[PDB]
Amino acid sequence: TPREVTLHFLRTAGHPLTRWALQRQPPSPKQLEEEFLKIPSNFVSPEDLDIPGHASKDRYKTILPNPQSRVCLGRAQSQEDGDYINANYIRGYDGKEKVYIATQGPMPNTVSDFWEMVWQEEVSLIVMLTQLRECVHYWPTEEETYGPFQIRIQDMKECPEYTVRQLTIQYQEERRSVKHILFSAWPDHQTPESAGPLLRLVAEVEESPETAAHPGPIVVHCSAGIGRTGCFIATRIGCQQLKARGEVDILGIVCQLRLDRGGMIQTAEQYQFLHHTLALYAGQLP
Description:
Layout: H1 2-12, E1 17-18, H2 19-24, H3 29-38, E2 87-90, E3 100-104, H4 111-120, E4 125-129, E5 143-146, E6 149-158, E7 162-171, E8 174-183, H5 195-206, E9 218-222, H6 227-245, E10 247-248, H7 250-260, H8 268-284
Parallel strand pairs: 3-9, 4-8, 4-9
Antiparallel strand pairs: 1-10, 2-3, 5-6, 6-7, 7-8
Helix pairs in contact: 1-7, 3-8, 5-8, 6-7, 6-8
Organism: Homo sapiens (Human)
Protein name: Tyrosine-protein phosphatase non-receptor type 7
Binding site for substrate: 188, 222-228, 266
C-alpha cells in the first residue's frame, strides 16, 4: 500500500513553528534536509492518467497533473478535441479550495489551451516565475488573437524586481481584465537571489484588487509548474499563517501542496529558503 502510505504521511505530517522558534531557534540545516527527504512526491504515473495524446501537451514526461485536482477544459469556447492541460487546482490558506492553479509555462502548442483555462476559470491574476536566460511569449506586444480570444496589453510597468502587465481578454461581447506579473531572476532548481524581492512579489499579489463575487484562482506558472510555483505558493500561505496565527507549519504546507499537485517544491535548498523567507516576514509583523 505505498499509495496509502504516501497519502497517510501527507495528510498527517506537521511541524508547527512559532514566530519565535522560526526567527530564533529554527530546525537546523541537517534537520531540514532530513525532513525534506521524507516528504513523498505524490507524483502520478503515466498509468494513472487515461488521456490519449496528453504527452504532446506536457513539457516533461514525468511531471503530470494529479487526476483528482486536474483542471479539465470544458471547451465551452472552442471545438478542440479533448480536455487536457497540465495544471491543477491548489488549495490556499486554511484549505480554501481553488485559490491557485499551478501549471507549466505554455508550450507553443498549448498557448490556446492556456487562455481557454484563463477564461473558463475566471482568472484575473497570473504570476510567471522565470530566469532571463531561460517558456514562450504567450501574451502579445500590443494585440493578438489566440483561438477565440482577443488579448490586448493596456499597460506595462517595470518594477525593480518584476514587470506588471495589464491585459484584457475578450470573447464575443465580454472583455475581462487580467493582471500579469513576470518575476525574473529565479533560476530553475534554485532560489531567488534573496527573500526581499519574493516577499515584495507576494505583497504585489496581495494588493491586487479583487472585483468578483467569487474570485477565480490565481494562475502561478514556471517551466515545470512545480518547483518555483510551489515555493511561491508555500511562501504566500506561510505568510498568511504567520499573520493570522503567529505560527506556521511549513512541513504541513508543503504536504498539502503535494496532495494538490505532485512534486511541489523541488529541492532541500528551496525548502530551507522557505524557512529563511518566512523568518524575514515574521519580523515585519506587529
